[PDB]
Symmetry: D2
């Protein structure tokens, strides 16, 4: 059934400014046409990211009042611990303040310099921590994942042949681990099949290679398996999640995504020796094995939220709400990355703004247009975010020139989705009018965060 009603009601609301177009235009200009510079208080619908922006439940808020704030041995940690062991089925769990804290720990524990880490594409923080610790990254995703127009299921799947080739050519001893991400963010949030997770587990296990999941959107992933993978029709979301992780040696998790919280993450593993070493390192960067840089109340909220995420109707609606936005855009001819993923819709700004060269920052400009026309903030994921080559001074020119409409969980309705869609569709119907942008201030680093622009 295409678009279910919200399987929840509103307990409480977040106050927003409903400032009109003329005032939004002034805010956009004061932000140098960079949506990253906009004030939260000036935004109606904020689709910058689905990270940490989720609406919690009444049950989680009750948990928020029961924070056992002890430095060691907090009841909230034990709740988190037993929840994650039950639901993910790992032996050991170390909390971290969010996903990149867990990635820091994992890559220091699991990588010898010179070794390879192979994955289904990559995410920036994850790959950074791998490389920082001496790894060489190797993309082993299926070639299809790089074709953003290709409508196929389980587009996040690892190519077993590529994995085999890496094993044959570099040797198993020289592969630190396989980093299998669910879903695959860089491909537009594409799911990985259970068949693929099993095949990868089976090949790596034969060579004694470890597999660690980047589990950030593992619940959206489980919903795709439920919906589209033959034989998972009688399985609960919890059963699918538990089976997914049975094919890994551990994971890095951002609770800020699929655990329905505003902060929080953790590291899981099965190996006792690695657990011991991880506990030795968490104290350096995060905090105790029993708080890991989180307040007691946040371990509690994340424990409760991960269990809420198992509800079929919740995750079905989460994914289908994103789908609604994608479908509506596609029906109007708006160019998007296909198929639509679990967490976001990516506009193809290259095609949307065909009259503009990449050097005129079509994605950055389209994101500015969207905020002005609708009060919606979206994220530039194109040439600006790619940054400038420091050696040569040339832009990094990504194949993907996109605007990301990233959907927080349980925050918005289908009517908000219409606001976004109708506005983008209206812009599309006169897309030729969207003006190119030029730098007026460009920092040396992290340019996407603070750069300012004006129209050409």
């Amino acid at each position: 059934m295409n678009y279910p009603a919200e399987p929840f009601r509103i307990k409480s609301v977040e106050t927003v400014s409903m400032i009109p177009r003329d005032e939004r235009l002034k805010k956009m200009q004061e932000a140098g046409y960079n949506t990253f510079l906009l004030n939260s208080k000036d935004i109606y619908i904020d689709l910058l990211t689905d990270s940490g922006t989720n609406a919690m439940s009444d049950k989680q808020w009750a948990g928020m009042m029961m924070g056992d704030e002890a430095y060691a041995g907090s009841e909230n940690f034990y709740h988190l611990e037993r929840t994650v062991q039950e639901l993910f089925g790992f032996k050991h769990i170390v909390p971290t303040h969010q996903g990149r804290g867990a990635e820091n720990l994992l890559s220091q524990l699991a990588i010898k310099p010179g070794q390879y880490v192979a994955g289904n594409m990559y995410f920036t923080t994850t790959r950074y921590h791998q490389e920082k610790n001496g790894a060489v990254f190797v993309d082993i995703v299926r070639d299809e994942a790089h074709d953003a127009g290709l409508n196929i299921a389980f587009k996040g799947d690892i190519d077993l042949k590529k994995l085999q080739k890496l094993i044959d050519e570099k040797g198993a001893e020289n592969i630190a681990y396989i980093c299998l991400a669910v879903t695959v963010n860089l491909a537009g949030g594409q799911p990985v099949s259970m068949a693929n997770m099993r095949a990868v587990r089976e090949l790596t296990e034969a060579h004694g290679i470890k597999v660690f999941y980047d589990a950030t959107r593992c619940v959206e992933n489980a919903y795709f398996i439920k919906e589209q993978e033959q034989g998972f029709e009688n399985k609960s979301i919890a059963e699918i999640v538990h089976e997914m992780f049975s094919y890994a040696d551990g994971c890095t998790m951002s609770g800020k995504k699929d655990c329905l919280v505003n902060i929080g993450g953790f590291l899981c593993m099965n190996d006792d020796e690695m657990f011991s070493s991880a506990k030795e390192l968490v104290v350096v960067y995060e905090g105790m094995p029993s708080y890991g840089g989180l307040a007691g109340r946040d371990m509690e909220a994340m424990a409760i939220g991960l269990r809420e995420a198992m509800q079929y109707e919740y995750i079905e609606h989460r994914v289908k709400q994103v789908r609604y936005l994608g479908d509506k855009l596609k029906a109007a001819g708006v160019p998007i990355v296909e198929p639509v993923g679990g967490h976001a819709v990516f506009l193809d700004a290259r095609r949307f703004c065909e009259h503009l060269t990449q050097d005129e920052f079509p994605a950055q400009s389209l994101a500015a247009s969207i905020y002005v026309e609708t009060g919606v903030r979206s994220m530039e994921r194109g040439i600006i975010s790619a940054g400038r080559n420091n050696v040569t001074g040339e832009h990094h020119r990504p194949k993907l020139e996109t605007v990301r409409l990233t959907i927080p969980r349980r925050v918005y309705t289908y009517a908000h989705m219409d606001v976004v869609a109708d506005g983008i569709i209206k812009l599309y119907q006169h897309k030729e009018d969207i003006r190119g942008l030029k730098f007026i201030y460009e920092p040396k680093q992290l340019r996407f965060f603070t750069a300012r622009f004006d129209y050409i």
Copy 2:
């Protein structure tokens, strides 16, 4: 716009679910076929009432943490007091735990036995407190308000000819006060025009008759004035509200409606001696005049909520979401009260259940049947709620035999409206299947709350 999106985001959620038809069926019998008697857990979308069921905002919840719980001199009481003085324009305020607490005070303060109270249609608790204190209720609303299907604006208006007649026939001295309600709940949430409020004030003042408003849905009422009364189109909701009350001597208010809270009300008046006497009486029934049977944190929430209610986009969306439900029902040919009111859609039980006489309680029955087929809870607003005539002993017989789909503020989405509209439509297909009801337990007053029936 016809149907604007929610002018807020979801801050927190609570889970909703439906129990099977057969468990609901047992449940409906268990509750004597009275919807009021089902359990919250057993209801899927709860449209029993917009009273006390509202979603509060983040700001209200911040105020909830700032409860100054002192018996006298609470910062929260000061903030409520100054908010109501600013927004309604009355000299004095006495908080009460809810609206009927205020009606109890007003009726004891302002009625000599044998006097008449004239109002624009009755309300259940209001009339009961009028009658308990020895008043005769006279209905002075226009005839058109009693005609369900008749689509005319400002149906809540007092017929000035009827008021004049009451003055000529009884004498001004025998009229305790005019009870002017905004909106008029039992006519279908129908608004009163500013022109009418001004006319009523002018006529009553000339004769020395006091006017007390039932302020309960005054913001919804102000929305209709802004939308439909010529010359108000560029006035703010707040200006409109402030002008409305300028035509009154005081008011009763259930804050559980338009003040966006879960508990709370108050009594306002301009008269100093009435204020003194009211403080004497409040102590007996409610609490000290400095809290009136409310926690400090609730006086705070109500102060905050009443000001939030003045936001144009909030009340526009509130009223239009109700209108959406009505539009869908009406497009499919489901009989409703017209025009759609501020807070609810009222299915016209007489037309829905042509095959029944009003004596067979079609509304109470329909309410029951909707629960059985859909798990949506709705309320009886016809012959049962009307009560017994305290002179003859016969049922009062309102022309309006209606079943209320009552919308809490900021709780539901258009998708929930769509779920409701689909189920109602389906039930309509087999309307002849709805059976007459008979009393098995009748309470001696306000019988609709806890009466039990059995099928005829």
Copy 3:
């Protein structure tokens, strides 16, 4: 063991102004030397009342986030219902917004005009509702209770001989009920023995007379039985509470006292017919049998708080903290009502300010002195609160001319108790310097609430 440490720690604090003596003096003067007129924000330690001023737990605050706000059938009501049935052992419970709401219902249900209601002294609201409904009040407390200097246990006990005398002289048919209060507020919060409750139950039952408790401080009462009544040494607080109520036909309860909440109360009874009638009346004044003028979250908080009140260490500390203040004052020779009761210490201002006549308002003036010297607000319970005879224009001259230091539960520490004690002791050491007060503004009614004074 004399004074135990707090059997809890501070989860959160309430911000206070620490304004110095000179600024307190200006606030006192702006309040016309009437502590009832002081702003909460200007008070360091507020001992005006133990009603509704309690600090809730983390567990109760979690309950506050789980308010099921449904108009009927709320999960919170069922929680409250089962808690009260378990702990108090009554068959039926109707929630009310606080104690006087329950008293309203009880007196309307249980009294025929002309009938007598006999009790161990009285409280103002309780006795008012009895008389409003046609009852004649008869004090049947032991004569000792009226001797405020007499240090004896179970000073709240009813004199069985007085009860017998009333039965013999007026006839059982003409006694509406016995109103047995635990503790007895007017006597300084004096406990009633289990022996007394049983004797009263046994006598009334033989004559078919009903007994309803005014149960407001029934848990403090149970602690005295535990501490001082032979044979209750192996009994839990819960066992004692449950046995107490086994000697009654029902009760009126203010949760705002011993249920550790800021708002809330309820009516209990065993009789089915009375329960039915009570449900018919609660809708008139309070709300539904399943909310009774409370938000869902408050029924939840009160359910949780009543169960917390059963913890031995909590109630032992509550009562012994009050005792600490009393003991400390008595050791310094400060005149107090004896023995110290469960909830408050009463200063004898007649003796404290011997140089002043009652017409110079010694209690009112002493309460003003206390606030000025310490930042502590206390309540005048003397000639000002007694009011003026409207017939004659003379003061009502009470035998008790007192200042009440009323202790909210779990809000203050022994260090706050020292602030209060040290300041009063310092004032006592030069008590001759305390000046008489004269009216400068006196309202006709409720004079204690708003009257203003100046020094003679």
Copy 4:
């Protein structure tokens, strides 16, 4: 006053309890005789640490409901930023999830391998991040700070002669920065004088050496300046704090101490290029510069808490409550570090356990023994926390072998202090009963957190 009462009221509470001696005994063995390894549920009064264990205020909890959870541009980040700029006077702020997150950034940003970092005594995580990044730690605190029993003011002061010597012997170019901590935790919470901060700034500035403060207990430190440094007696806490930081180039802060929160920290600096580089690095480890691994609601709580910390009566009471505990212990002859510091009383493990050598870990053992006899949890602050010398491999041997009774802010009362003091005193009676400990598990760094021992 010696011991002022709490300058706040209790808003909410959490229950405390003690489990029997024999269950505690099993528990202490279960945790390898390391206090860090017991469970919060099993501790009666938890004095393990003042880090993250503070009670928040009603205002902070109101801010907690107002979490603006946006990835960038959150109102909460803006409020934190402007609060720290106003109160500390630094140009730039980068939030971090807690203090060691900030130390990680500072150490990576400001140290070239082979450089020296000189500080007023070491701290565990600080030294580890210094050393990890290739710095040699040089202790430049006065000798007197290493002498536990020596009662002198401003023990935290840097010995300027030692700083001068470091500059002459190594050269200014080889000193990365001076790490000046306020207060000095491991000397016993000992304050640094303004005179010393000014002297240090003057000497370092002349040589072009940067100074970065560990701001963690800066408010406690400001209290000691106000109380004891001539000429500061009429300065506000805020003026003092602002002046302190005027002598620094930046700071690291764990907000979990003096900012009155349960999570949170930040890095401040004046230098624009260091700020740019820090924003680059924060993204890797913590989060975007606009949240730094914190929920918006926590940036809010920390902004609010830091301003609350400036209230004179709050910090006076905070420090004096610690002092009370120390005074009681000292009056009974229990050996402690003197003078008593801002946040904790440190029992002098060397004198408490004369019969043990430092190699037999007297502090770790005493910590264990106190838990067994009292159920009060305390922390090791001696040879175990000092760690291994990263050149020789031997334990570092601090003269200060101490056991910390660490007081969370606004959680406990003087009665709790009395309970602690009684139990410690009793244990002192039989001090010879405390047995040597030996390692059974030693972590490779920050070993004290999770090391396990067995008795010798």
